[PDB]
């Protein structure tokens, strides 16, 4: 078959929610296992998987057997492998703050592991590949997150009410420089004690007096992590709730979070992060505020502002490991191409793909594999389809 519906994975972290993925896409739930991600690719831990001839393969050996005609000459002399892994995200919970280092700094980072040889997966198992992890992530529902650092006066007016929770803070409001916020940032991390629990005090007895965002974001992420010093990242960094259909991209050397939503994910293959709060687990304070970047991201530059040209919807991202674009369908075939493997996700709606005499269906929460081997494919039917692919 030129065109190879995909079987994928669903992970059953804890955070997950028990019935988005069933709502949106009727994936069965009998168990009311938390469904977390919806995984669309060539992952070793967990490929997608293809049907040939009867069997199912794994993606991922399909591609290892056959690189250049799978992938596309230039993405197998590039990467090697499918160099993406495409999700669905469905946080019930919020999630942890996250930094990931660019490409330069990822395989020094690798490299200390393996040298001052930390085991694979452990403590400081923070780089466990020498990968950038650039990422897009597209709303399906209303999707909270916070990203990036807030311009510095936005800081000063969030910080005010809270000056007494730390001297790092009054500092900073003194003189609100990026020396003083990578220090304040270092600081809320670093709170022990009798420290963590007065600055904690002054953030709550605040959230009584303070209406309206980020505050109310505060709120909610509290009722998970009542403890964590995480809970003044909003004070520090936007919070944006995207509408479905928009997007943004996390870039490298920048705190983020999801807290709460349905999204699409696209990222680099890595599994390295650093993480900035909102988690029980390791946190390395020096390495993060090593690998941060303290410059303020205006809130009208957040969202990844689309292009669109006929059909195609394209968000262009800045890294070559992957794009990204929405395809509306129609009555009329649209012809969808790309030198690359692509992934096809039906967002909403009925997707019928033809290639020659075959015809294959996608219903929402649905998608096929095209080798790059098999462009053009066409496409009708209503509503709209997603593509991952890579336009190297």
């Known amino acids: 078959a030129s065109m ?19 709502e949106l896409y009727g ?22 998987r293809i049907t040939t001839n009867g069997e199912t393969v794994s993606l991922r050996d399909a591609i290892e057997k056959n690189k250049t005609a799978m992938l596309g000459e230039a993405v197998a002399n590039r990467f090697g492998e499918l160099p993406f892994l495409f999700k669905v995200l469905c946080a019930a919970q919020p999630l942890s703050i996250q930094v990931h280092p660019n490409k330069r700094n990822s395989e020094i980072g690798f490299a200390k592991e393996n040298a001052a040889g930390i085991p694979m997966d452990a403590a400081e198992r923070n780089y466990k590949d020498p990968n950038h992890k650039p990422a897009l992530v597209f709303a399906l529902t209303p999707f909270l997150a916070m990203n990036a650092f807030r311009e510095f006066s936005d800081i000063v007016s969030l910080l005010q009410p809270v000056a007494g929770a730390h001297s790092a803070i ?44 980020p505050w109310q974001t505060i709120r909610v992420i509290s ?51 650093l993480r900035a709060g909102l988690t029980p687990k390791y946190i390395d304070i020096p390495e993060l505020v090593a690998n941060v970047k303290f410059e303020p991201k205006p809130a009208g530059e957040l969202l990844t502002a689309p292009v669109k040209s006929g059909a195609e ?47 294959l269906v996608l219903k929402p929460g649905e998608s096929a594999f095209i080798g790059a081997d098999e462009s053009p494919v066409n496409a009708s039917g209503t509503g709209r389809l997603a593509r991952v692919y890579n336009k190297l």
């Open 27 to 48: 994936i069965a739930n009998p168990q009311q296992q938390p469904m977390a991600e919806l995984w669309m690719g060539a992952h070793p831990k967990s490929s997608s």
């Open 223 to 273: 009722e998970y992590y009542p403890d964590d010093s995480g809970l003044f990242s909003p004070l520090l960094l936007n919070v944006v709730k995207l509408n479905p259909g928009e997007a943004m991209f996390l870039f490298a050397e920048t705190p983020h979070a999801y807290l709460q939503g349905v999204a699409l994910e696209v990222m680099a293959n890595s599994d390295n992060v």
């Open 313 to 359: 919807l394209d968000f262009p991202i800045p890294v070559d490991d992957f794009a990204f674009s929405l395809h509306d369908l129609a009555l009329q075939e649209t012809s969808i191409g790309q030198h690359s493997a692509a992934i096809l996700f039906c967002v909403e709606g009925e997707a019928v793909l033809r290639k020659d005499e075959q015809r």
């Open 170 to 213: 009054a500092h900073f409001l003194q003189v609100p420089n990026a020396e003083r916020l990578s220090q304040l940032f270092a600081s809320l991390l670093n709170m022990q004690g009798e420290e963590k629990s007065r600055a904690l005090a002054v953030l709550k007895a605040a959230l009584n007096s303070q209406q309206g965002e």
């Open 4 to 22: 190879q519906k995909l079987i994928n994975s669903v992970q059953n972290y804890a955070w997950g929610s028990k019935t988005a993925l069933t």
